[PDB]
Amino acid sequence: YAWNRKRISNCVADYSVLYNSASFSTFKCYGVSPTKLNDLCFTNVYADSF
Amino acid sequence: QDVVNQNAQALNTLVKQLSSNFGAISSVLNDILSRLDPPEAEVQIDRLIT
C-alpha cells in the first residue's frame, strides 16, 4: 500500500548479476528477454519496492 | 500530371506504412529481434510480416 519509488539514471550496470543469482527465484519479464538486458539499454529506470 | 501525382502518392503511402506497429511491440524489425528470444520474436515478426 506504500510502495517506494527509486530512480536509476546516468549509470551503467550488468543485468547478469540479478538474473543468474539463485537468490532471486521468481523471474518474469513482460516484453523483454532476460538474457538480453545486458545489451538492451534504457533511457530511465524506475524501481518500485514493497 | 495526375498520373505522376497518383504514383507518387501510392509509393509515399507504401513507404510510410513501414513506420507502423501493426500490433507489434515496435515497428523496426531489428529492434524486436534484438530485445526478444526467437520463440516470441517469432510471434512479433509474424504479425509484422502478415
From Swiss-Prot, chain B:
Residues 1-45 form a coiled coil. Changing N21K: In strain: Omicron/BA.1, Omicron/BA.2, Omicron/BA.2.12.1, Omicron/BA.2.75, Omicron/BA.4, Omicron/BA.5, Omicron/BQ.1.1, Omicron/XBB.1.5, Omicron/EG.5.1. Changing D2N: In strain: Delta/B.1.617.2, Mu/B.1.621. Subunit of the fusion protein that is processed upon entry into the host cell. Mediates fusion of the virion and cellular membranes by functioning as a class I viral fusion protein. Contains a viral fusion peptide that is unmasked after S2 cleavage. This cleavage can occur at the cell membrane by host TMPRSS2 or during endocytosis by host CSTL. In either case, this triggers an extensive and irreversible conformational change that leads to fusion of the viral envelope with the cellular cytoplasmic membrane, releasing viral genomic RNA into the host cell cytoplasm. This is Spike protein S2'. The gene is S. The chain holds residues 949 to 998 of 1273 of the full protein.
